Amino acid sequence: GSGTILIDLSPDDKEFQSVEEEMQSTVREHRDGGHAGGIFNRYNILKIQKVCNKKLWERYTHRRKEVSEENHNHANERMLFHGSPFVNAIIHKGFDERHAYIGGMFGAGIYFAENSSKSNQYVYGIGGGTGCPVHKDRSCYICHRQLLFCRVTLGKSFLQFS
Amino acid sequence: MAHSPPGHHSVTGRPSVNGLALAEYVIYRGEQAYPEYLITYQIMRPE
Ligand SMILES: CC(C)(C)c1ccc(-c2nc3c(NC(=O)[C@H](O)CO)cccc3c(=O)[nH]2)cc1
Numbered sequence: 001g002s003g004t005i006l007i008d009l010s011p012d013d014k015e016f017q018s019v020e021e022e023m024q025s026t027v028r029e030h031r032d033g034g035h036a037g038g039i040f041n042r043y044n045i046l047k048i049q050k051v052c053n054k055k056l057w058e059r060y061t062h063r064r065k066e067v068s069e070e071n072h073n074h075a076n077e078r079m080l081f082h083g084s085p086f087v088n089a090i091i092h093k094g095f096d097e098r099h100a101y102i103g104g105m106f107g108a109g110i111y112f113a114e115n116s117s118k119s120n121q122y123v124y125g126i127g128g129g130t131g132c133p134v135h136k137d138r139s140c141y142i143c144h145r146q147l148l149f150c151r152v153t154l155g156k157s158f159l160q161f162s
Numbered sequence: 163m164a165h166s167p168p169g170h171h172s173v174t175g176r177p178s179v180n181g182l183a184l185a186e187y188v189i190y191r192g193e194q195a196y197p198e199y200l201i202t203y204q205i206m207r208p209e
């Protein structure tokens with residue numbers, strides 16, 4: 001009883017298909033040769049579910065309006081990927097400081113990617129951790145993985161070259 | 163949790179060397195993201 005329901009989408013749904021497309025078309029090679037997240041060019045999409053939670057949605061839209069009004073009515077809202085071992089907390093409790101990376105490059109915040117394959121590197125933790133629970137294989141082709149595709153308010157974003 | 167740079171709401175990490183890489187972003191308030199879709203998948207072995 002968290003308030004969260006997961007609505008399963010059909011593969012025939014226009015909305016399943018555009019989310020899958022964004023997932024598949026933003027795969028790239030990584031400078032570690034696949035070390036953290038595995039060696040692949042594409043995914044097998046198995047399921048896509050919508051995350052519905054009225055409280056967490058209102059919490060998001062309330063902050064969006066704050067940011068918007070501090071930035072000439074421009075939330076600068078994107079759809080971005082998030083991979084984390086805490087995806088199950090996140091979908092039930094929402095994002096908070098337990099999902100931030102204290103040791104991150106750009107500070108102690110919550111990190112999102114335009115490249116799905118980048119988020120794929122944190123599904124099993126920092127650096128890919130030890131890989132999947134069952135095989136300890138960061139390149140497991142067997143075990144199922146989960147990513148979030150999230151709605152993110154960037155507001156006035158500080159540009160950092162790197 | 164850190165704070166955003168003053169007068170900012172997030173940080174864009176621009177890809178600098180990697181020609182093919184897209185941007186990465188950071189927010190410092192969890193209220194600035196909502197998890198809309200949960201995607202279950204497998205990576206696929208290249209043939
Ligand atoms: C510490 C725990 C809670 C385990 C964690 C850490 C990182 C990520 C995570 N990190 C990302 C990221 N992070 C970095 O580029 C460097 O870690 C910053 O130094 C870039 C792009 C996307 C992601 C992303 O989807 N998830 C999730 C959870």
Ligand SMILES: [Zn+2]
Binds near residue numbers: 142
């Ligand atoms: Zn496995």
